[PDB]
């Protein structure tokens, strides 16, 4: 028989190999598939879909319906934050549970741009102007509008169009960021501050809620497949 | 407990290869790993052990690191593993240039964090020469066969 020499690796089983092997049921009549609506080809496709972010994860608000609601009010104007959020989609408790994060939890590295969308949910008569801002890392996370306004941001006016979108432009030292909390691959800060204030006329609920969504952009990608921690089997 | 090792993947644990790689500032290379396993008994006894298998599971940064030799982690639904049967030719797998940068960095004159003034020294402190603590991940190796009366 053709002279051969066995090389390193033979007989070993790689769980990620891609070899041919014998078939158990030769000549099996496979039933043809049908046009089942909504077919997916790539994980990222799901990543680009907006998903509601559980922002307020207080011990009394975590794991409930209240976590997604960020309550605003008609209190006088201040420069203190409404909500802070760190750009680490796969490691920050808040983001890590949204579609994006979950998919992200199956990879070691992520890259691309992200976009946050905020939905106002007050009465028609309620007006206002908010400021959502993404500050790249490497400095003091803003605590006052004064600082946040110095970075990347969108000044949103509440009106007939109820939803506003601020894109977080991919600005990073490395071509790919770690899917875990890391300084070297840090992401920065997402912040929301009252631009003016919330104003409501009489006989109107003085406090209402805003809902947040997040989604990857056409330019986003993920690499180095890995096992997730968001699930386990004890014994 | 049954000894199962976890090693942080880095060329700097040994001397030889490191110095060779240190002849330059940066590099890119598809990486080939080979696995030479060697076993023996320990206790004075004439007992028997049937040919042993060994799983080498690559745990990329952030993935669940096994805490037990028989816990869920060894299911490896996404991790790349290699089940080596003892006695056969050494194990080998190919890993491409998996760097987060446009070149692997042998020397990194800098810190991961920046010590801000509106922050406590502790909060802004880090190592000198380090990028990401977890650069490539860890390998996890365990005997697949269960307990045997002879060690």
């Amino acid at each position, epitope marked *: 028989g053709l002279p051969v020499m066995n090389t390193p690796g033979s007989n070993q089983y790689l769980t990620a190999d891609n070899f041919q092997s014998p078939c158990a049921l030769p000549e099996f009549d496979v039933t043809p598939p049908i046009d089942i609506p909504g077919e997916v080809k790539n994980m990222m496709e799901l990543a680009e879909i907006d998903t509601m972010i559980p922002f307020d994860l207080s*011990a009394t608000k975590k794991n409930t319906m209240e976590m997604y609601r960020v309550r605003l009010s008609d209190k006088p104007h201040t420069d203190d934050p409404i909500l802070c959020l760190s750009l680490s989609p796969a490691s920050d408790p808040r983001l890590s549970h949204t579609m994006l994060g979950e998919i992200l939890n199956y990879y070691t590295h992520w890259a691309g741009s992200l976009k946050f969308t905020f939905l106002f949910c007050g009465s028609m008569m309620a007006t206002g102007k908010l400021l959502v801002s993404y500050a790249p890392p490497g400095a003091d996370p803003p605590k006052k509008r004064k600082e946040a306004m110095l970075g990347t941001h969108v000044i949103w006016d509440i009106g007939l169009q109820s939803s506003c979108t601020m894109v977080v432009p991919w600005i990073s030292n490395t071509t790919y960021r770690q899917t875990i*909390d*890391d*300084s070297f691959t840090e992401g920065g800060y997402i912040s929301v501050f009252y631009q003016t204030r919330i104003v409501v006329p009489l006989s109107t609920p003085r406090e209402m809620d805003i809902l947040g969504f997040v989604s990857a952009c056409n330019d986003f990608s993920v690499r180095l497949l890995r096992d997730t921690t968001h699930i386990e089997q004890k014994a | *407990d049954k*000894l*199962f*090792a*976890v*090693w*942080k993947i880095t060329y700097k644990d040994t001397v030889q290869l490191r110095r060779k790689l240190e002849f330059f500032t940066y590099s890119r290379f598809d990486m080939e790993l080979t696995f030479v396993v060697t076993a023996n008994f320990t206790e004075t006894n004439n007992g028997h052990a049937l040919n042993q298998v060994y799983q080498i599971m690559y745990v990329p940064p952030g993935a669940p*690191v096994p805490e037990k*030799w028989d816990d869920y982690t060894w299911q490896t639904s996404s991790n790349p593993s290699i089940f080596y049967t003892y006695g056969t030719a050494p194990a080998r797998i190919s890993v491409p240039y998996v760097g987060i940068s446009n070149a692997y960095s042998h020397f990194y004159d800098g810190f*991961s*964090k920046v010590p801000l003034k509106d922050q*406590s*020294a*502790a*909060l802004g*402190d*880090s*190592l000198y020469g*380090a990028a*990401s*603590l*977890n650069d490539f991940g*860890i390998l996890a190796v365990r005997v697949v066969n269960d307990h045997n009366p002879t060690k």
Partner: nanobody
Amino acid sequence: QVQLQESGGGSAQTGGSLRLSCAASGFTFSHGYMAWFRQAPEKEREWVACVRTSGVSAYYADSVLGRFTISQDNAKSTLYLQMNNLKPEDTAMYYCAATSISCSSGYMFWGQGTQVTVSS
């Protein structure tokens, strides 16, 4: 199998002191740090203190300053957390997070933790 196992208990009266220990094994590649973290009853996990590899250079959390003492015995491959002046804010779970680090945040190994209770 870098086995991190905490000890030290937690059932003191208000004002006392406890000795929180942590047995370490596996391969702790010395260089980096070794630390302590608390989760608290109902709060976010918070950093307590970090000590350098073998070096006795350390820091403490603003909240715990001077009232907690973190050392080490690399001969015994252990780290210690002496805690004087325990209080109602200190009542919580404590974790020996001693691996990698390089700073005061990065990890690949934690422990099972132990609870402390400062009653009064």
